[PDB]
Amino acid sequence: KVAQTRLECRTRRPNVELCRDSPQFKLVNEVFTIDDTLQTLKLRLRETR
Amino acid sequence: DDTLQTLKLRLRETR
Amino acid sequence: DQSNRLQLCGAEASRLWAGRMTGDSMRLMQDKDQLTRQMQEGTCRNLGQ
Amino acid sequence: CLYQREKRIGIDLVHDNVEKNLIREVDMIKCCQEQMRKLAQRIDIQMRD
Amino acid sequence: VPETWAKFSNDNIRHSQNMRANSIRLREEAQNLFDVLADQLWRQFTNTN
Amino acid sequence: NRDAQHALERDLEDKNSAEFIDEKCLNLRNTSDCISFFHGVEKIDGTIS
Fold first, then answer.
1. What is the 3-state secondary structure (H, E, C) of chain A?
2. Which of D18, E15, E17, F33 is the most exposed place for a label (fewest CB within 10 A)?
């Protein structure tokens, strides 16, 4: 939720200031990694059940 | 699964 | 005798399996928490730069 | 400082960026204390539980 | 009552872990409030100056 | 000179809006309110600069 709320507010930047920088890379990276984290956690939960 | 994550990291970086 | 031995062996098989699963489950939790915290603070520092 | 604005006499007796900045600072500090007190009360209820 | 060893609930432990997790959430909330509230106060102070 | 001043002050207000977006993203925490889910992560990468 932190990642996606940071990502949404930073697309409303003004015209010349809409900049693909390294924070965009870190936010996309963190969204993908936390998705993979969540996935392996529910797989382990199913095995434990 | 972690090496796959490292390879995805390097893919995004090189792109 | 085969029935008794099979029941006791099945109980101890379930023993060793669930014990190893519970022992392995905590390291995944700890590593995922550390990874999440470190990447979020990296995102914040990048935003500051 | 807001009380020290008052003894100003003449055509300077207007409301500027400094006046609204001081008003915003005062309201921000009052909200600061209110949030901290409400959080302390929640901590008290949790401690009782 | 069988002999009170055929039991796997003792719900006081579960309730107590729930309260411990809730208190950890409250402590994290207070630390985040400390950081962001101090930072906001500096921003307003330097804007007024 | 007036035209060049207009171009400069254009770029100033763009930078200031980018500022406000950047501190509002930096202030965000885990326990902070006004936070929500946003499925649209893969469309934020479309930028210009």
1. CHHHHHHHHCCCCCCCCCCCCHHHHHHHHHHHHHHHHHHHHHHHHHHHC
2. F33
